[PDB]
Design a binder for this molecule. Structure first.
Ligand SMILES: C[C@]12C=CC(=O)C=C1CC[C@@H]1[C@@H]2[C@@H](O)C[C@@]2(C)[C@H]1CC[C@]2(O)C(=O)CO
Lengths: 249, 10
């Protein structure tokens, strides 16, 4: 009998290549535009993943769009943290197999601070020694952890899906452990990490919003990312969105 | 909408 976790493993997309061009000397604008082109393709991959995620299709189409538009940066930064953890133990930002940022390219304008923020996310995977299955369940919960303050169209369906994957995270914890000496402590630590992701990616999202709206900086965005940000941005800046937290603020 | 198109596509 197939398990939900076994299905999360098989639907996880393969990692994308950048195609970045060595030949041009690096500039902050060129690098950020290259990263946004990669991000747009990773978001397309994430939409295909969400369509395959058991239960997601049960949601009203408008809620499917809301959840992807609200959570895309959390999904992308979490997966970047995982790749950087597995490929470098959190020492380098492993955007793609052909695009690694190490401390010496972080020195371009605007790159250092955002790169430190991305590395902190990877540093949490190292600190907690997160297992693949724990990561996969947590990543689903990120898709389900930012919602409109005034609710979703299919709220009861959403509540069912979210509780289902909360229990799946518990199952992933029990599989990681040899027995149960610290299953609650582990669940506490991982839900504290999920809660912290809202703040840990907030600076990335605000910088994304600035580079999107400030045409002066000449940072390019691909079409589907631009459409998503143009919808997400007014809702976030107006304070009409809320995180679903496990623990008291 | 590109996102909507993708969600509806096979
Ligand atoms: C999704 C993305 C691309 C590929 C990847 O593996 C992970 C992520 C997370 C961080 C994103 C990044 C790019 O899109 C560029 C972004 C938005 C960046 C945060 C600030 C940023 O550098 C920027 O705002 C440049 O305009």
């Amino acid at each position: 009998a197939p398990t939900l976790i076994s299905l999360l493993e098989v639907i996880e997309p393969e990692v994308l290549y950048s195609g970045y061009d060595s030949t041009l000397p690096d500039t902050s604008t060129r690098l950020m535009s290259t990263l946004n082109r990669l991000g747009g393709r990773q978001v397309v991959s994430a939409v295909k993943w969400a369509k395959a995620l058991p239960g997601f299709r049960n949601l009203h189409l408008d809620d499917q769009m809301t959840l992807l538009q609200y959570s895309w940066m959390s999904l992308m930064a979490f997966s970047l943290g995982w790749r950087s953890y597995k490929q470098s133990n959190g020492n380098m930002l492993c955007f793609a197999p052909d695009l690694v940022i190490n401390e010496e390219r972080m020195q371009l304008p605007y790159m250092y601070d955002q790169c430190q923020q991305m590395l902190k996310i990877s540093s949490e995977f190292v600190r907690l020694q997160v297992s693949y299955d724990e990561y996969l369940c947590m990543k689903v919960l990120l898709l389900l952890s930012t919602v409109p303050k005034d609710g979703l169209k299919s709220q009861a369906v959403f509540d069912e899906i979210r509780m289902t994957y909360i229990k799946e995270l518990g199952k992933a914890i029990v599989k990681r452990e040899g027995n149960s000496s610290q299953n609650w402590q582990r669940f506490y630590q991982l839900t504290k990490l999920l809660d912290s992701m809202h703040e840990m990616v907030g600076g990335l999202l605000q910088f994304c919003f600035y580079t999107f709206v400030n045409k002066s900086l000449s940072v390019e965005f691909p079409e589907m990312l631009a459409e998503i940000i143009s919808n997400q941005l007014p809702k976030f800046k107006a304070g009409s969105v809320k995180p679903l937290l496990f623990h008291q603020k | 909408s590109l996102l909507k198109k993708l969600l509806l596509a096979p």
